Swiss-Prot record, chain A:
Gene Ontology cellular component list: mitochondrion
Similarity section: Belongs to the IF-3 family.
Name of the protein this chain belongs to: Translation initiation factor IF-3, mitochondrial
Compartments it resides in: Mitochondrion
Encoding gene (name): MTIF3
Main location: mitochondrion
GO BP of this protein: mitochondrial translational initiation; ribosome disassembly
Keyword set includes Transit peptide: yes
Swiss-Prot record, chain B:
Residue ranges the record marks as coiled coil: none
Cellular component, GO annotation: mitochondrial inner membrane; mitochondrial small ribosomal subunit; mitochondrion
Ribosomal protein as UniProt keyword: yes
GO BP term (any one): mitochondrial translation
Segments traversing the membrane: none
Assembly and oligomerization: Component of the mitochondrial small ribosomal subunit (mt-SSU). Mature mammalian 55S mitochondrial ribosomes consist of a small (28S) and a large (39S) subunit. The 28S small subunit contains a 12S ribosomal RNA (12S mt-rRNA) and 30 different proteins. The 39S large subunit contains a 16S rRNA (16S mt-rRNA), a copy of mitochondrial valine transfer RNA (mt-tRNA(Val)), which plays an integral structural role, and 52 different proteins.
Subcellular location: Mitochondrion
Source species of the chain: Homo sapiens
Domain of life assignment: Eukaryota
Shown residues in whole-protein numbering: 58 to 194 of 194
Protein's name according to its UniProt entry: Small ribosomal subunit protein uS11m
Keywords in alphabetical order: Mitochondrion, Ribonucleoprotein, Ribosomal protein, Transit peptide
GO molecular function, a single term: structural constituent of ribosome
Family: Belongs to the universal ribosomal protein uS11 family.
């Protein structure tokens, strides 16, 4: 998270690859020499590219710093590209009541619907002996509620010496969805 | 004579001069000490903008702007743009009870400006608009 704003007269790094306001490459210069050009022409320096190992800073007028972000405000509006995926977690118990399982199963539908990743964990019920046969039958029982909407990303594993099972769900991908749709029609319509 | 703390009224003629200028002619340094920022704007007696500086314009972000070091830095930056235009004596009009209320005044003194008066113009209503509800934090 950054913004196209002036860095000020406090530079952390001694050597900077300074750039002119008109786009000319002034070349690497000492940190002190950078501030002299900020006063001689009353200009503010903005870090254009952080990624490069050599520091890159461009000195431009305040009006030029307004037009720049005014364009980053349109490019993102025109073509927004926010793809981070949130991860949600649930920790159930083998002996979880159905009423609580329908409440937690409806919460997974809201997350899936928001393209989130739902990590579900199941643990042995309080002083209850149970294997992994019916302890893994809760995932299939939750996934069934979301037939086409959801699919496994990971699969059940013995996270803690078998006393727990962990799975991760995701919203079905567009292509996968279309494939599911196609299959659904054949079973009923063709018959 | 003695020394009064009350500002010299314009109408009545006095002998208090600063570089040959009356109290009315001296430029004004408007300081807005907010809770998360501190804006400074120097103007003349005829409302002509001479300099503007703020913590945001000095390269501070978010919670660094609501400090006394950022307000002082903005005072030094506004006292360097106005000192090139022939400004020495100023009338401070502080507005707000923020952290950079007095720190910006020190930065103006660390820029070559001499303060002759301190005016407080913090907006106080005689009940007018209703503020936001109290918070539970």
């Amino acid at each position: 998270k950054t913004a196209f704003s002036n860095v000020g007269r406090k530079i952390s790094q001694r050597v900077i690859h300074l750039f002119d306001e008109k786009g000319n490459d002034l070349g690497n210069m000492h940190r002190a020499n950078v501030i002299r050009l900020m006063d001689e022409r009353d200009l503010r320096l903005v870090q254009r590219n952080t990624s490069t190992e050599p520091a890159e800073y461009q000195l431009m007028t305040g009006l030029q710093i307004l037009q720049e972000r005014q364009r980053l405000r349109e490019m993102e509006k025109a073509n927004p590209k926010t793809g981070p995926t949130l991860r949600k977690e649930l920790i159930l118990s083998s002996n979880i009541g159905q009423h609580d399982l329908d409440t937690k199963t409806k919460q997974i539908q809201q997350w899936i619907k928001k393209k989130h990743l739902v990590q579900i964990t199941i643990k042995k019920g309080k002083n209850v002996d149970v294997s992994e046969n019916e302890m893994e039958e809760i995932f299939h029982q939750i996934l069934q509620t979301m037939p086409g909407i959801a699919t496994f990303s990971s699969r059940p594993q013995a996270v803690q010496g078998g006393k727990a099972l962990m799975c991760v769900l995701r919203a079905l991908s567009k292509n996968e969805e279309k494939a599911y749709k196609e299959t659904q029609e054949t079973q009923e319509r063709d018959t | 004579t003695k020394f009064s703390i009350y500002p010299p009224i314009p109408g009545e003629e006095s002998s208090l001069r600063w570089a040959g200028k009356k109290f009315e002619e001296i430029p004004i340094a408007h300081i807005k000490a907010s809770h998360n920022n501190t804006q400074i704007q120097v103007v003349s007696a005829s409302n002509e903008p001479l300099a503007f500086a703020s913590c945001g314009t000095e390269g501070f972000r978010n919670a660094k702007k609501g400090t006394g070091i950022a307000a002082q830095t903005a005072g030094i930056a506004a006292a360097a743009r106005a000192k090139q235009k022939g400004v020495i004596h100023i009338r401070v009009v502080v507005k707000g009870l923020g952290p950079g209320r007095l720190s910006a005044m020190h930065g103006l003194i660390m820029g070559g400006l001499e303060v002759i008066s301190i005016t407080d113009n913090t907006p106080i209503p005689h009940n007018g608009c209703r503020p936001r509800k109290a918070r539970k934090l």
